[PDB]
Assembly symmetry: C2
């Protein structure tokens, strides 16, 4: 056999750190001339869980998804190797230095189209795949400002009507109200998460940030609180955002539809 997606840890020359998380650290590294990003785990049934995130990334092949390039399968330094996006997360990008001049309206909307295209790809796998944690921080930017979806660790396969485990994980500021209430959810929960991301690209603001997880669960989850949309916002853009936030998940548009509404907004 051999799919050639197995990497020896000696073949990787680790470089400067680029991010941190509960799972472990992440560094930029050199791999046979190629520039890659390595996701090392903290030195547990999670070993079986790791193989899950690896087996699932191999099933993903789309231009708007972070390119999986292999993995180290030998402890203690397990790692997930992917391509390197030199512009970091869209989150840190939207709120850094001067982004008004760098990121004009057309560019920001385009970035949203990239996300929708990738998300649409996921929802159309067999079985479909729910990201369960779609947020600005989990979106990385290309040298040429192409946005790719990343961090599929909390991503589960949806073969049934709803999700199964009730793992109920994900960042509260971006999760859908039904998820915040810890009740049956589906692919429509991601659509809501996107609603927030579109809001960020459209208004250049940070969602909440004056509220802790508990306060978010309470407000947005059980008290029908939603992010404020400025009257100044493009009605067509606002319309797309409001659609993704509908209280009835089945009333929210699919990413396929979201693409159809965004395409004309560009140029």
């Amino acid at each position: 056999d051999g799919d050639d997606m197995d990497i020896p840890w000696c073949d990787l020359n680790i470089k400067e750190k680029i991010g941190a998380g509960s799972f472990g650290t992440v560094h930029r590294a050199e791999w046979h001339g190629s520039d890659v990003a390595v996701k090392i785990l903290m030195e547990a049934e999670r070993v079986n869980e790791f193989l899950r995130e690896v087996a699932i990334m191999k099933r993903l092949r789309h231009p708007n998804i972070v390119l999986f390039m292999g993995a180290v399968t030998q402890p203690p330094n397990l790692s997930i190797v992917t391509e390197y996006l030199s512009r970091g997360s869209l989150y840190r990008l939207l709120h850094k230095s001067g982004a008004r001049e760098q990121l004009d309206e057309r560019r920001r909307l385009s970035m949203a189209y990239d996300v929708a295209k990738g998300m649409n790809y996921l929802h159309n796998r067999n079985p479909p795949i729910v990201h369960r944690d779609l947020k600005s921080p989990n979106l990385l930017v290309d040298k040429k400002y192409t946005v790719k979806v990343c961090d599929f660790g909390l991503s589960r396969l949806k073969a049934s009507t709803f999700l199964s485990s009730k793992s109920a994980a994900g960042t509260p500021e971006w999760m859908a109200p039904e998820v915040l209430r810890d009740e049956p959810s589906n692919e429509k929960s991601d659509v809501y998460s996107f609603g927030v991301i579109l809001w960020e690209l459209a208004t250049l603001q940070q969602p909440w940030g004056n509220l802790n997880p508990a306060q978010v669960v309470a407000a947005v989850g059980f008290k029908c609180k939603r992010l404020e949309i400025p009257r100044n916002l493009n009605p067509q853009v606002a319309a797309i955002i409001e659609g993704c936030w509908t209280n009835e998940p089945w009333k929210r548009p699919s990413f396929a539809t979201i693409m159809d509404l965004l395409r004309p907004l560009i140029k």
Copy 2:
């Protein structure tokens, strides 16, 4: 649990034709390119070659290699599905109206560097993969001017020092002397092909093109002839091109070395 890379023909909404059969197509919202297998090519031997090409592309994951997205493996129209690159082939692009205006020196060198990265990735896979058909037409240009390698129909894995049971095949204008003569070839034969491609990017000239296939076999293969390098060409760029055209394949630089030479020339 499944491969998720197998596609039914009815899931593809074929669009306009690209080259020749190749078509653009909408696949579950996504935008892909389709390499269809001809009707009369549907037999044991030919289909096996198809299966080999599919097997190889599953083993390729790199930003400068065209993204394999799936494959229809059911008659009729067994095809290979990849991402779509809207600017077409580098060939058509270099010989298009208002070329020099459209492509500055910096960009043209960057495209050369892109090819070098993807080719180094191939030769560094285990076992290494010799393209055996590297040329302008088999290089596709991304919307944002990113170059990627395509057409692995002739690509083979080199376990030994040379290709076992060498098969006479390829395109004359880009083929290395040893190849033209049906001799034991290696990864250094691709290096030669690259030199021609770089020569195209540097001069915007069509290689040969005043000669027929037989004249080329005679000229390059047996008469030690090479393409004419302009007088006004960058001496450092010319140095690279000449290095790739060494009579002895071993004296030619690896794609790893080529990258190191190009990187500085991009300021």
